[PDB]
Design an enzyme around this catalytic site. Structure first.
Site, mmCIF file in Angstrom:
data_model
loop_
_atom_site.group_PDB
_atom_site.id
_atom_site.type_symbol
_atom_site.label_atom_id
_atom_site.label_comp_id
_atom_site.label_asym_id
_atom_site.label_seq_id
_atom_site.Cartn_x
_atom_site.Cartn_y
_atom_site.Cartn_z
ATOM 1 N N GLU B 42 0.836 -1.197 0.000
ATOM 2 C CA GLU B 42 0.000 0.000 0.000
ATOM 3 C C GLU B 42 0.873 1.250 0.000
ATOM 4 O OE1 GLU B 42 -3.816 1.420 2.762
ATOM 5 O OE2 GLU B 42 -1.976 0.812 3.771
ATOM 6 N N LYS B 124 -9.821 0.785 -2.777
ATOM 7 C CA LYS B 124 -10.029 0.073 -1.516
ATOM 8 C C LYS B 124 -11.453 0.271 -1.010
ATOM 9 C CE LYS B 124 -8.284 1.771 2.399
ATOM 10 N NZ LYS B 124 -8.347 1.857 3.889
ATOM 11 N N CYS B 166 -4.832 -3.692 2.375
ATOM 12 C CA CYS B 166 -4.637 -3.430 3.801
ATOM 13 C C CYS B 166 -5.884 -3.680 4.651
ATOM 14 C CB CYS B 166 -4.113 -2.004 3.994
ATOM 15 S SG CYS B 166 -3.498 -1.642 5.685
ATOM 16 N N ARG B 170 -9.345 -7.349 7.236
ATOM 17 C CA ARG B 170 -10.099 -7.592 8.468
ATOM 18 C C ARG B 170 -11.531 -8.032 8.228
ATOM 19 N NH1 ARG B 170 -7.364 -6.487 13.204
ATOM 20 N NH2 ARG B 170 -5.735 -4.896 13.103
ATOM 21 N N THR B 196 -0.722 -2.813 15.983
ATOM 22 C CA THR B 196 -1.627 -3.758 15.346
ATOM 23 C C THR B 196 -0.860 -4.752 14.504
ATOM 24 O OG1 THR B 196 -2.018 -2.197 13.523
ATOM 25 C CG2 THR B 196 -3.632 -2.253 15.343
#
Lengths: 291, 293
Positions: B42, B124, B166, B170, B196
């Site tokens: 990224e 994204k 990125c 999640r 993180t």
């Protein structure tokens, strides 16, 4: 460092793959001549026998374009120098269209850079509808909904139109208002209307806007039976016109083979003409508004 | 032939031209190693100080992309062999975007082939917005426009790739859907914070790998970014790695240098085929309960 442009004049058939081979050959030839921007006619991908025939061929155009984008990348990498392409095609209706019940093809002009990226999709604004007898281009062709934005090409500011657009001067005037130095009118004219008005219209738009005018045309008798009565013959006479109305370059009329028509644009002489006769500073915007 | 991929790990500055020289160097090193597809993180074009710094730097990125497309053509032609490039960048607002008041930049992942052709721009989908009374406050979408599409699978020289960026990692439904569309390989170009990163980077990569039985490419920014290099402190966890459909780490960055480095792995497609045949997770789902994506 010279503002060299070219026209790829051809006579598209109803066989998209054949037509692509001609386009690639003309691009290769243009790279050899150091052409910076190469202009192809309306309906370079194909000419059809009728609207139903056109609908079926339009479904093959997306693959035409993608193969064209890769050919462009390959050829400029092999040549080690860039060239930009302006080319008119038929775009099939999208999936939004399908669901909306629109079957209509789109008369679209692509501006493609040397990395095969599409920078503009101009969809033709003006269609031929007559309702006395009756013939409706808009039954099968979707009109566009925008005046295109000016493109900053390697040879200057381009305003892009398609064919029948040339008869509506407010479109050309507006593109000059947005900063165009060059206009193009990729086209296919009948012999009759071609002989009557092709050159007059080009020169008129040239001096009306003080722009270079690129006139890429189909030329010859089209083989609309090459993908397997109806006859289709285009006037041709591709040409490049200067802001004063002078013909810089025109097609060799003694062969119907595909050919490259080349001219170097004298941008400095254009600056002088626009400075010496400032037509855009002289408009009566208190009378006509501002565009 | 050999399904050889590479990660280009680096530490982007605020100086696009400096970052481009690193990128080209790594492309050249990758051609010498016969890498077929090379993945960058990224924000490879730049990291910025703030959202207004990003808005100004993004205007330089189109020139960055054009000069990269040209270096790819040159380097592959000189090397006599092809390579594809996956790289995250920022795109400035479009002409129409400004004509509607949207000055936001775009987080976009480019896939560029051996001829300089851009085959995909993925914007994204997932942004970090948070508004907790008494902090933390952060609205990425104030400065960054979200994308609108799940990307199409790309047929690369080494297999079918589903590309993510990125924070996308999640959200497991995205990865599961990409597997649904045919992905053999997922990539998550990223820049993670140290906290993180240590907590979740490797766990997330391995989870998405075994969730979807895919190779997972984890290209990462690593180190402390020089965000004043075009004239605030930013440190990325790094730890770029490549993970197999079983969750095995095939290849991982050297953590002892912040120098740009190439991380390489040869993907065992046949072993993947067998894993996917022998545990057919995608035939076993309860679509009568969950529908279909």
């Amino acid at each position: 460092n010279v503002a060299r442009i070219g026209i790829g004049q051809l006579c598209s058939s109803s066989n998209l793959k054949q037509n692509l081979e001609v386009v690639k050959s003309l691009i290769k030839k243009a790279l050899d001549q150091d052409v910076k921007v190469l202009f192809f006619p309306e309906a370079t991908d194909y000419l059809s026998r009728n609207a139903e025939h056109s609908k079926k061929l339009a479904s093959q155009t997306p693959e035409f374009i993608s193969e064209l984008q890769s050919a462009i990348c390959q050829l400029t990498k092999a040549a080690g120098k860039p060239i930009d392409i302006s080319i008119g095609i038929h775009m099939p209706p999208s999936e939004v269209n399908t669901k909306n019940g629109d079957s209509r093809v789109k008369n679209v002009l692509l501006y493609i850079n040397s990395n095969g990226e599409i920078l503009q999709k101009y969809q033709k604004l003006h269609l031929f509808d007559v309702d006395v007898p009756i013939l409706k281009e808009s039954n099968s062709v979707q009109p566009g909904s925008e005046i295109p934005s000016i493109i900053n090409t390697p040879v200057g500011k381009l305003g892009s139109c398609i064919c029948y657009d040339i008869r509506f001067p407010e479109l050309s005037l507006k593109l000059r208002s947005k900063g165009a130095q060059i206009l193009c009118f990729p086209s296919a004219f009948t012999m009759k209307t071609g002989e009557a008005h092709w050159e007059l219209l080009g020169r008129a738009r040239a001096i009306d806007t003080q722009s270079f005018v690129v006139m890429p045309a189909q030329q010859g008798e089209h083989d609309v039976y090459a993908d397997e009565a109806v006859k289709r013959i285009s006037w041709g006479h591709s040409m490049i016109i200067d802001p004063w109305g002078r013909i810089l370059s025109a097609a060799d009329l003694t062969t119907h083979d595909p050919q490259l028509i080349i001219a170097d644009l004298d941008i400095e002489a254009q600056d002088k003409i626009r400075r010496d006769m400032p037509l855009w500073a002289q408009r009566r915007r208190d009378i006509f508004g501002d565009f």
